[PDB]
From Swiss-Prot, chain D:
<comment type="function">
    <text>Functions as a scaffold that mediates the ordered assembly of spliceosomal proteins and snRNAs. Required for association of BRR2 with the spliceosomal U5 snRNP, and the subsequent assembly of the U4/U6-U5 tri-snRNP complex. Functions as a scaffold that positions spliceosomal U2, U5 and U6 snRNAs at splice sites on pre-mRNA substrates, so that splicing can occur. Interacts with both the 5' and the 3' splice site, as well as the branch region. Has a role in branch site-3' splice site selection. Associates with the branch site-3' splice 3'-exon region. Also has a role in cell cycle.</text>
</comment>
<comment type="subunit">
    <text>Component of the U4/U6-U5 tri-snRNP complex composed of the U4, U6 and U5 snRNAs and at least PRP3, PRP4, PRP6, PRP8, PRP18, PRP31, PRP38, SNU13, SNU23, SNU66, SNU114, SPP381, SMB1, SMD1, SMD2, SMD3, SMX2, SMX3, LSM2, LSM3, LSM4, LSM5, LSM6, LSM7, LSM8, BRR2 and DIB1.</text>
</comment>
<protein>
    <recommendedName>
        <fullName>Pre-mRNA-splicing factor 8</fullName>
    </recommendedName>
</protein>
From Swiss-Prot, chain E:
<feature type="repeat" description="LRR 3">
    <location>
        <begin position="74"/>
        <end position="94"/>
    </location>
</feature>
<comment type="similarity">
    <text>Belongs to the U2 small nuclear ribonucleoprotein A family.</text>
</comment>
<dbReference type="GO" id="GO:0030620">
    <property type="term" value="F:U2 snRNA binding"/>
</dbReference>
<feature type="repeat" description="LRR 1">
    <location>
        <begin position="36"/>
        <end position="57"/>
    </location>
</feature>
<feature type="domain" description="LRRCT">
    <location>
        <begin position="105"/>
        <end position="135"/>
    </location>
</feature>
Curated annotation (Swiss-Prot), chain G:
<comment type="function">
    <text>Plays a role in pre-mRNA splicing as a core component of the spliceosomal U1, U2, U4 and U5 small nuclear ribonucleoproteins (snRNPs), the building blocks of the spliceosome.</text>
</comment>
<protein>
    <recommendedName>
        <fullName>Small nuclear ribonucleoprotein-associated protein B</fullName>
    </recommendedName>
</protein>
<feature type="domain" description="Sm">
    <location>
        <begin position="2"/>
        <end position="77"/>
    </location>
</feature>
<comment type="subunit">
    <text>Component of the Sm core complex, present in spliceosomal snRNP U1, U2, U4/U6 and U5. The core complex contains SMB1, SMD1, SMD2, SMD3, SME1, SMX3 and SMX2 (Sm proteins B, D1, D2, D3, E, F and G, respectively), and is probably a heptameric ring structure. SMB1 specifically interacts with SMD3.</text>
</comment>
<comment type="similarity">
    <text>Belongs to the snRNP SmB/SmN family.</text>
</comment>
From Swiss-Prot, chain I:
<dbReference type="GO" id="GO:0005685">
    <property type="term" value="C:U1 snRNP"/>
</dbReference>
<dbReference type="GO" id="GO:0005682">
    <property type="term" value="C:U5 snRNP"/>
</dbReference>
<feature type="domain" description="Sm">
    <location>
        <begin position="3"/>
        <end position="70"/>
    </location>
</feature>
<dbReference type="GO" id="GO:0036261">
    <property type="term" value="P:7-methylguanosine cap hypermethylation"/>
</dbReference>
<dbReference type="GO" id="GO:0008266">
    <property type="term" value="F:poly(U) RNA binding"/>
</dbReference>
Length: 82, 69, 75, 106, 135, 65, 78, 82, 70, 81
RNA sequence: AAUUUGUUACAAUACAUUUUUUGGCACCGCGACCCUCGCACUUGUGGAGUCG
């Protein structure tokens, strides 16, 4: 039922994240809240035609995150099980 | 949960600063927990009144700055 | 005190010239007669008329304007 | 979804007989099923890469055009060579064509 | 008493009267501050050269009072009471800087010291607590 | 299926997950927009393998048979 | 910076903070919220006009989470 | 319950500063605050986003449209936190 | 007497048009819910009163809606 | 705390305070208003007392933004102290 | 010459329609002049005139 659960299950994944203001964010999801507040590690902020800015730790808010670009290899059906 | 304590402002003329850099005036007649405002009508800020009484939605209110002290 | 819900009810009972303003939209307004009432600010308003604001008149039918984008009422 | 023993008929070729001869159609069947034996979900991703081309109700394989079926034959074909090189640790650039055609055929 | 990572980690950290770190012969290992300070106070130490910094994007104020600065390898730089002796040694500051203080340095008594700084470091607006004027 | 979005992104993709909020897990993802600083006319689109999506973004989803 | 699990566990760390308007609040997180509102000990709003960093020292600030975009760690404690 | 809310409540009496979404800073004696940051303030100045300032009596503000609130630094000391 | 939800219910399997937060729409209503999300068939996209394209089978998200009309 | 007066009151408040901080940092780890009453003055507070005394003797009459500053020990103890 | 048991307190393990996280998003300062010499805890701080 819940995508929140799925999100929670996705742990330690090196992923890109896309915001409502279009910022591309390359980082390892250490955790996510019940309300989609992403907590990243080894983070890399780039804009959508300008230079890059890297950071160690970023807690991004749930309302901002438009699209979390998932990893390359992932078994989705399995994840979707309760 | 708690009621907006606007009993001080009851039956006084207030500048309801509203969404999109607009304004409203008028004497305060009522309100609720969502901060909707019921007020006896006045102008939109040169100036022109519309309506006899008016009801402003909660979300729309930036501010309700008191004209009278 | 006169609550908003009560006011709305009164308006409905009356069937009077209501002129609604749009949230985050200056240029347009609505003008009609209140028919419906909801728990939220949403209502149905038959014989509505869209208005371009003075910085004329335009054709429009029966409409429910959604509660979230309401701003002003008068009736 | 079958809880009871029964016979069921299916169609491999969808309609491939019009544009494609049974020889080549069964051959591409064998290749596709080899990648389904080996690559699994990636070979699936080659099918579902573009969802705008959908598998029909009666049929099994999603319906492409001739050039699309050819390019799919190229990708799917090359998959077996890639996985060969990965697990067997034998570079493709060291290989003789007889071995490539043998492995792809089997 | 090397400027070390361990040294920086136990150093008084506070909001000054900006985020400032309270601090040695050689400036090194600044990486460990993690670019978290607006100001770094290196007063009363024995540093010889203003050099050895990692990339520090935050750092806007450097208080380097009473050290032994004799050579130079950022908006405010306070170098009062150090050892800069030749006008040419101040040349590296042209590549930075709005508030500059070089008082109590031998270089101060050199003929035309003020005009030299103004022409070679035009980005400075206040020099030695006096307004750089048009004239 | 195709999805219209608040930021002018036509998301042509294969749906995997679904919920109350209309958040979606997406495979075979192909977005469509236009990077363009005026006057200019460019039409751009990128493939992505797997992609999570947030629901406030979604305006209108549609199904092309 | 350390490798934390949550925000709560990294209380009183000096924090960079971004908000929807584009301003950058920097200061020590004194207290968190259910809705990500932040109390900041010594808060400095840093803004960029359309050039170079404009700077304003605020003090003790309650910061609403609606407007908060994302938080980053500026330095260690003390 | 929210500790920021508590702090705000405590700040009652004191001269708080207060910017909105619009970017119109106020400063004034905090008259009343609620769980939703529905602030009232007395003797309050009002800066426009562009620059110009205007004095005003008893402003009300709805927390939805509030951005950030500055409280005096005495409240840092005690005794809400612990 | 006529509330909105019942009106909405009544208007199922009938022509409707929707404006957004802006572009007009036009299609036959399939079904509705408490949240006022929509599902339509024979959707036509009136770009400010200009039918740009006919999409067909669509699902409109509630929060972007402005008003419903025949 | 030292009380300084005879300061050029044309300097903006935040610039005055930042130059004051810079100048006085040389003696040890370190309030100024522009009201009519308080303009041209400042209170500089140091952690160490020896630092305040040294500052007072060494910067008496130091040209700052064009004028010679006059320094003195403050009448009362600073709230922060 | 720490371990177990019981009781009390606190924290952690639910959902979208106005106040937070289902978004209304996207396409005083710088030249001049002159006033004030004042012991504080600060929205801001002299005044005339010119430039932005």
């Amino acid at each position: 039922m819940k995508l929140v659960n799925f999100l929670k299950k996705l742990r330690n994944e090196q992923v890109t994240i896309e915001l409502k203001n279009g910022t591309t964010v390359w980082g390892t999801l250490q955790s996510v809240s019940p309300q989609m507040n992403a907590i990243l590690t080894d983070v890399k902020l780039t804009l959508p035609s300008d230079n890059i800015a890297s950071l160690q730790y970023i807690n991004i808010r749930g309302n901002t995150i438009r699209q979390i670009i998932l990893p390359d290899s992932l078994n989705l059906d399995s994840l979707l099980v309760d | 949960v708690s009621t907006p304590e606007l009993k001080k402002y009851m039956d006084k003329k207030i500048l309801l600063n509203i969404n999109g850099s607009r304004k409203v005036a008028g004497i305060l007649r009522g309100y609720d927990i969502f901060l909707n405002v019921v007020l006896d009508d006045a102008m939109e800020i040169n100036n022109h009144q519309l309506g006899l009484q008016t009801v402003i939605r909660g979300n729309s209110i930036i501010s309700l700055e008191a004209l009278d002290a | 005190m006169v609550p908003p819900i009560n006011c709305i009810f009164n308006f409905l009972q009356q069937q009077t010239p209501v002129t609604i303003w749009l949230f985050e939209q200056i240029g347009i307004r609505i003008k009609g007669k209140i028919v419906g009432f909801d728990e939220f600010m949403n209502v149905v308003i038959d014989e509505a008329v869209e208005i371009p604001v003075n910085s004329k008149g335009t054709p429009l039918g029966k409409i429910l304007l959604k509660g979230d984008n309401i701003t002003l009422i008068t009736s | 979804k079958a809880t009871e023993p029964q016979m069921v008929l299916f169609n491999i070729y969808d309609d491939w007989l019009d544009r494609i001869s049974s020889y080549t159609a069964f051959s591409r069947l064998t290749l596709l099923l080899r990648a389904l034996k080996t690559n699994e979900e990636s070979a699936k991703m080659i099918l579902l890469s573009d969802p705008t081309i959908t598998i029909k109700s009666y049929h099994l394989w999603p319906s492409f055009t001739d050039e699309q079926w050819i390019t799919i034959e190229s990708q799917m074909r090359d998959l077996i060579l890639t996985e060969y090189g990965r697990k067997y640790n034998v570079n493709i650039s060291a290989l003789t064509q007889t071995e490539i055609k043998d492995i792809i055929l089997g | 008493m090397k400027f070390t990572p361990s040294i920086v980690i136990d150093a008084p950290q506070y909001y000054v009267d900006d985020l400032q770190l309270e601090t040695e012969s050689m400036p090194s290992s600044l990486k460990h501050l993690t670019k978290p300070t607006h100001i770094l106070d290196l007063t009363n130490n024995d540093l010889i050269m203003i050099p050895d910094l990692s990339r520090r994007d935050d750092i806007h104020t450097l208080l380097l009072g009473r050290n032994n600065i004799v050579e130079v390898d950022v908006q405010n730089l306070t170098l009062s009471n150090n050892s800069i002796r030749r006008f040419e040694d101040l040349q590296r500051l042209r590549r930075a800087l709005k508030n500059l203080t070089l008082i109590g340095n031998q270089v101060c008594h050199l003929a035309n010291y003020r005009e030299h700084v103004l022409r070679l470091v035009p980005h400075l607006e206040t020099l030695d607590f006096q307004n750089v004027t048009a004239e | 299926v195709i999805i219209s979005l608040r930021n002018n992104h036509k998301i042509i993709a294969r749906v995997k997950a679904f919920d109350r909020h209309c958040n979606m897990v997406l495979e075979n993802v192909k977005e469509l927009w236009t990077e363009k600083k005026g006057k200019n006319v460019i039409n751009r689109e990128r493939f992505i393998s797997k992609l999570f999506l947030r629901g406030d973004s979604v305006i209108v989803v549609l199904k092309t048979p | 910076v350390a490798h934390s699990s949550r925000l709560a566990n990294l209380i009183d760390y000096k924090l960079r903070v971004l908000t929807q308007d584009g301003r950058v609040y920097i200061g020590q997180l004194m207290a968190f919220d259910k809705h990500m509102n932040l109390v900041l000990n010594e808060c400095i709003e840093e803004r960029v006009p359309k050039i170079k960093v404009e700077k304003r020292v605020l003090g003790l600030t309650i910061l609403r989470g609606e407007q908060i975009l994302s938080t980053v760690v500026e330095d260690k404690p003390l | 319950n929210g500790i920021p809310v508590k702090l705000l409540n405590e700040a009652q009496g004191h001269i708080v500063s207060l910017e909105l979404t619009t970017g119109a800073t106020y400063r004034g004696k905090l008259v009343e605050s609620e769980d939703s940051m529905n602030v009232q303030l007395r003797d309050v100045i009002a800066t426009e986003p562009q620059g110009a300032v205007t004095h005003m009596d008893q402003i009300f503000v709805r927390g939805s449209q509030i951005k950030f609130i500055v409280v005096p630094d005495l409240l840092k000391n005690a005794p809400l936190f612990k | 007497p006529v509330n909105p939800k019942p009106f909405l219910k009544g208007l199922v399997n009938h022509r409707v048009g929707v404006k957004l937060k802006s572009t007009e729409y036009r299609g036959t209503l399939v079904s509705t819910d408490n949240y006022f999300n929509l599902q339509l068939n024979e959707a036509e996209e009136f770009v400010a009163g200009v039918s740009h394209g006919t999409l067909g089978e669509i699902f409109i998200r509630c929060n972007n809606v402005l008003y419903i009309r025949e | 705390t030292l009380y300084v007066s005879q300061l050029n009151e044309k300097i903006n408040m935040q610039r005055l305070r930042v130059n004051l901080f810079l100048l006085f940092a040389t003696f040890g780890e370190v309030v100024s208003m522009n009201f009519k009453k308080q303009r041209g003055q400042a209170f500089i507070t140091m952690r160490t007392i020896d630092q305040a005394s040294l500052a007072q003797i060494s910067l008496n009459g130091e040209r700052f933004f064009g004028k010679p500053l006059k320094v003195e020990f403050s009448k009362s103890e600073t709230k922060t102290l």
